[PDB]
Amino acid sequence: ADDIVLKAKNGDVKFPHKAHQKAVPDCKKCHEKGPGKIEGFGKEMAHGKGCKGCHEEMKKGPTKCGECHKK
Ligand code: HEC
Numbered sequence: 001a002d003d004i005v006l007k008a009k010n011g012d013v014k015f016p017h018k019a020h021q022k023a024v025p026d027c028k029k030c031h032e033k034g035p036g037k038i039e040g041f042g043k044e045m046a047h048g049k050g051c052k053g054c055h056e057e058m059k060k061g062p063t064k065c066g067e068c069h070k071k
């Protein structure tokens with residue numbers, strides 16, 4: 001649905017694929033080739049302009065460790 005768990009060898013990341021909708025009604029923001037899986041995505045990405053990127057972008061959202069990686 002919206003709740004998506006991103007397996008990580010450094011602590012899984014709980015991503016709410018919902019609140020990120022009303023906050024970013026634009027799905028073309030992340031989904032470039034349309035809704036679906038994202039090819040290439042990864043660490044550098046998540047930390048880059050994948051997750052934090054946006055976060056640190058607006059200074060909103062978890063940008064510190066532990067806030068994403070929960071053991
Ligand atoms: C970035 C903040 C996103 C926005 C905006 C939207 N979605 Fe999304 N979606 C995102 C991720 C990170 C993922 C998983 C892939 C990954 O790289 O981790 C997804 C996945 C989907 C899927 C596939 C899951 C499934 O149902 O099988 C769909 C169908 C999907 N997303 C649809 C969708 C729609 C309709 C959105 C706007 C209403 C939308 N997404 C916004 C990240 C982001």
Ligand code: HEC
Pocket residue numbers: 013014015016019020023024029030046049050051052054055058060061062067068
């Ligand atoms: C902008 C394009 C974003 C991208 C890309 C991602 N996130 Fe995000 N996130 C964003 C905002 C603006 C906020 C604050 C809430 C709001 O009003 O939109 C957040 C918040 C989170 C949170 C915590 C919010 C909560 O649950 O209360 C988490 C855990 C989070 N974001 C995770 C996350 C992940 C894992 C992403 C990559 C898959 C990701 N976000 C991308 C804006 C954006």
Ligand code: HEC
Pocket residue numbers: 006007008009010013042043046047051052055062063064065066067068069
């Ligand atoms: C959410 C906004 C995150 C924050 C904050 C940080 N990281 Fe992260 N990291 C995130 C994701 C979504 C992923 C990949 C999970 C997936 O499968 O989608 C990662 C990955 C890592 C890794 C590599 C794990 C692996 O599987 O190889 C490392 C070593 C890592 N992250 C470290 C790390 C550090 C040091 C952080 C603070 C500076 C940090 N993460 C925050 C999402 C998020």
